[PDB]
Design a protein around this nucleic acid. Structure first.
Lengths: 147, 52, 125, 198, 51
RNA sequence: UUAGUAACGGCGAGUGAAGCGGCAAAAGCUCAAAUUUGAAAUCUGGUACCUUCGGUGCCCGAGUUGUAAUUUGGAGAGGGCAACUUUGGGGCCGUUCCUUGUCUAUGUUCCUUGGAACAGGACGUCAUAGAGGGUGAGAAUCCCGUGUGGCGAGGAGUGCGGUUCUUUGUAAAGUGCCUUCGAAGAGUCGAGUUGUUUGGGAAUGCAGCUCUAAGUGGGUGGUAAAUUCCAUCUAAAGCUAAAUAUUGGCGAGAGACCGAUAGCGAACAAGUACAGUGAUGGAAAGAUGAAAAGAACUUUGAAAAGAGAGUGAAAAAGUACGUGAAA
RNA sequence: UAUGCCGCCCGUCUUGAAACACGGACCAAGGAGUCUAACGUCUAUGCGAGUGUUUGGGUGUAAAACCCAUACGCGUAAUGAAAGUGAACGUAGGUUGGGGCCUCGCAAGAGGUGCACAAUCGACCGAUCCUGAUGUCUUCGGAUGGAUUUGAGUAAGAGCAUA
RNA sequence: GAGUAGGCAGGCGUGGAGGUCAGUGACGAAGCCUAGACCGUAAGGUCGGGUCGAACGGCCUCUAGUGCAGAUCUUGGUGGUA
């Protein structure tokens, strides 16, 4: 919408909002990140600390598919079971009707232990787990099956 | 439900009667119909330029 | 329009009419037939050829009639006999009439016109 | 020429990009061209599907191996199993991949029954006998869908031993990290001195 | 069948007809009902006298 | 999509891929290295005849310093035994794809202003046709077309259907078990070095120069080497539609674009007139009216023209022509 | 138009312009903060632990509209150079505030419960520095508990898409 | 209740776009001229008279090649000097 732009509200006023002393010139500091160590040091060190210099070791041909391992907390673990069959498990599953949560089909590598799960055997199938994840699943009365 | 009365081809009510199919009880927001229509109308357009 | 190969473009249609060659200006300069001639043949309108007799239906020259002299294709007009303007000097000049404002009161019948009439579906010659 | 306080952006427009901007107005125009192109190919290939029977194949890269997917072509092993020729398969509408080899029984058996189910459902016309008019089923790949094999049940019993699956993974990682160093500390101090000793 | 009723879910994928902010679009009915007319305090002439 | 990421970089400015994943389209193959060796089986050419994008007979030539049949790594070849199973050619229309032709409804009814009715009011008509343009002002119904179907003629024909002569064939293809084999590309691969290039970093590709392999062999496995395994391909020879590009050429549809200082430099006899030795530079310039009805004829003046007369709906439209602003 | 009084020529750079500083003879028309990729804030809209149909398919009265699968981007977890590890002692903590609501009351008020947010003391996750249990491929494992250390963290999710 | 540079808000005007007023119009659209009128603090709007001859407007929204006195601005035309 050109008609809302202040350009339309600027017609008449000599300098078009850019002042009579600054004049609005082409590039009165350079062209993008120019003088970051020179005359834009204060803005770089503030707001962008750590920009300049190297840190850590390089990795040639780093395939992001090796480091997949997306995470599921236990507060969100029970949300994996469909709501059609959920409540039948959450009210008296109890050993031999202990539900089977395959977290890899759900698309998670690791399970982490943030949440409090209800006291139910909840046989979990995960590639990786935390120490506190497998603690809380055994405590609730289930198990972690590695795959 | 007002229970709408059906008309024949030659005007003529005194036919069957249907209920409202439930979309008519929905909110009418001229502000959302405005903004959505505005952008939907721009979809059937052709480009212009001064050649090069 | 449903057929995509035809154009509804005013620019194209204007040029296609004005730069139409002689053979297609034949068909553009068509005239409707009289109530009597349409009852006879059973055909709406034909392309005006040279020596057909017609009646004027519109314009200042409305009501006048006679044989057509010149099918002036190049001017998109047909000049009719007896329908002329006498200049100030006293020399006559034929008035340019469009054939769609005329009506074919009498047909000029040759083998190619009998063929044209039978083709459209006329119940005679 | 530096911000108030804004993220440092990397806008790659220091070449003559304006000379090779490609705007896709042709999207709708190409879409009807592709549909016409499909309709005319189905008129040419009159009673036969547009696509060939693809095999099932488990995706590579451990991120994606959790799901199966329609591969390129069956195999010389699966074709011989199903009971036809790699030549005859290509002609009667089966993709055959000379490259791929079978190291997996569940994938092999899945694809072998997939060839048997395709052979069951098609009715191959004779060369010069008679043409029986069978209205064309367009998408073979839609007729034979890729079923992601469900490898478990709803609910089970806790067949527990209590080995701490975290401690299992942590020991398995240690066995990996010290496999070679322990073979070296077994080649010296354990052996190469016992080899001389009585 | 298309937009969905209360009984019929819908023909579109997991679509619900949008819900109402306001129960009754008629504001007068609520303002004049009973319980609001009980709680509120008597009004003041509709134009303050020029004192 | 990965991703403005891994990587590069006076590690500053800045640059910067690839794999997997979803989808578009899909289709595969060919030589060299083999003893046809109980038969150069192969090919150009010339000549004659025919049914002529070619065919056949005969004759010269090419060629054994290797032209055909067979084999291409997924294989496969030779030898052995055992049972089947499948095949080619053209002619003739229909239908197919292009090139076109033709036909296929409806008011010119009444009144009113006007030069003209295509305008207003009344009464209709057709409509799978109220796209568009023309006609003396805004026309579905005046004309051309538009819509819907029809009937033609002329090409490219192998997609198929019907369809009739054959007849390949005694010759070719796939398939099973055994047995011996199983050729697979060199100034190349690779290495050093120089230059260049890449995101490719003790070197990503390319190139010059020196060296120059091997046959369980060679390449690759994104930190140089040595020792040990593993995985994965099979280089140095070659053919191959579609999905992709398309400010050119030809043919068509379009537009919330421009509307004669705008839009292409060019709406006009525009790359024209014209400048410069040359390369090259490169304009301005659309509108009378429905119709020339472009002003008969008279009078002043040598004449151009003037004042009349007239044409025109208007000359406050006179070819210095719609409107005709301001300086 | 006359008369009383007032009134330097505008635009610009400038501490300062009537300036002996610059542009302007006059007029018509043209004539200068645009579009885009990627983003910060704020706001509207949708849906909301999700979100985003439109690369693509289906469909169509045909560049429109309508419908749609699998992914993918971002968010739902952080911290380390990295191999890695990964968020409840408690009513998801205590303390001082805190709108609003509940109780007793005429009211003044007192008492209770206290969201957001604010300060503060803690607890939890990763890192760094130690501590170094049961054990054991005897050098692996790292329980357990600390540290004026540290993080763009957790502590009943706010985001995604569009304008 | 001042105000440069500057910010923000409310409007005025232009080319187009969707919708609507069954809007105006050859008995005269638009354009231009007007020491005539009325409205608006204003940007501007409305009307009468003339010339003219074919289109144009109000309102709710969309969009922008949208408003000129200056640029020794561009093109074209015109002057005073004369």
């Amino acid at each position: 919408p050109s008609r809302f732009t202040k350009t339309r509200k600027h017609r008449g006023h000599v300098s078009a909002g850019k002042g009579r002393i600054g004049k609005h010139r082409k590039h009165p500091g350079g062209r993008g990140m120019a003088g970051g160590q020179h005359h834009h040091r204060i803005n770089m060190d503030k707001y962008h600390p750590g920009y300049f210099g190297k840190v850590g070791m390089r990795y040639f041909h780093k395939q992001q598919a090796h480091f997949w391992k997306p995470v599921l907390n236990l507060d969100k673990l029970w949300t994996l079971i469909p709501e059609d069959k959920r409540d039948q498990y959450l009210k008296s599953a109890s050993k031999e009707t202990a539900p089977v949560i395959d977290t890899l089909a759900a698309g998670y590598g690791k399970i982490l232990g943030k949440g409090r799960i209800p006291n139910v055997p909840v046989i979990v199938k995960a590639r990786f787990v935390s120490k506190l994840a497998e603690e809380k699943i055994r405590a609730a009365g289930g198990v972690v099956e590695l795959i | 439900r007002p229970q709408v009365t059906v008309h024949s081809l030659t005007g003529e009510a005194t036919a069957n009667a249907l209920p409202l199919p439930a979309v008519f009880s929905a909110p009418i927001r001229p502000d959302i119909v405005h903004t959505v229509f505005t952008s939907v109308n721009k979809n059937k357009r052709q480009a212009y330029a001064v050649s090069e | 329009k449903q057929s995509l190969d035809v154009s509804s473009d005013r620019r194209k249609a204007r040029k296609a009419y004005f730069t139409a060659p002689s053979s297609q200006r034949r068909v553009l300069l068509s005239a409707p037939l009289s109530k009597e001639l349409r009852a006879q043949y059973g055909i709406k309108a034909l392309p005006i050829r040279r020596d057909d007799e017609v009646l004027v239906v519109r314009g200042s020259k409305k009501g006048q009639e006679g044989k057509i002299s010149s099918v002036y294709r190049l001017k998109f007009a047909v000049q009719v006999d007896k329908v002329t303007k006498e200049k100030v000097n006293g020399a006559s000049v034929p008035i340019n009439l469009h054939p769609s404002k005329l009506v074919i009161t009498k047909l000029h019948l040759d083998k190619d016109r009998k063929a044209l009439i039978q083709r459209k579906g006329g119940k005679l010659e | 020429a530096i911000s108030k306080n804004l993220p440092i952006l990397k806008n790659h427009f220091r070449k003559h990009w304006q000379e090779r901007v490609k705007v896709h107005f042709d999207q709708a125009g190409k879409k009807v061209s592709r549909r016409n192109a499909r309709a005319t190919r189905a008129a040419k290939i009159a009673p036969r599907p547009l696509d060939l029977l693809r095999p099932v194949v488990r995706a590579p890269t451990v991120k994606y191996n959790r799901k199966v997917r329609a591969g390129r072509g069956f195999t010389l092993a699966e074709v011989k199993a199903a009971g036809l020729t790699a030549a005859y398969a290509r002609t009667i509408g089966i993709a055959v991949d000379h490259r791929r080899q079978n190291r997996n029984q569940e994938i092999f058996d899945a694809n072998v029954q997939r060839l048997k189910e395709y052979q069951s459902k098609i009715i191959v016309f004779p060369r010069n006998g008679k043409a029986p008019e069978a209205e064309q089923v367009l998408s073979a790949a839609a007729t034979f869908p890729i079923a992601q094999p469900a490898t478990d049940v709803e609910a089970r019993a806790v067949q527990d031993n209590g080995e701490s699956a975290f401690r299992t993974l942590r020991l398995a990682r240690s066995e990996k990290k010290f496999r070679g160093i322990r073979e070296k500390r077994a080649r010296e101090k354990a052996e190469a001195e016992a080899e001389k000793k009585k | 069948q298309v937009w969905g009723s209360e009984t019929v879910a819908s023909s579109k994928v997991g679509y619900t007809l949008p819900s109402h902010i306001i129960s009754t679009s008629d504001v007068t009915r609520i303002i004049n009902s009973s319980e609001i007319q009980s709680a509120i305090r008597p009004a003041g002439q509709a134009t303050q006298k020029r004192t």
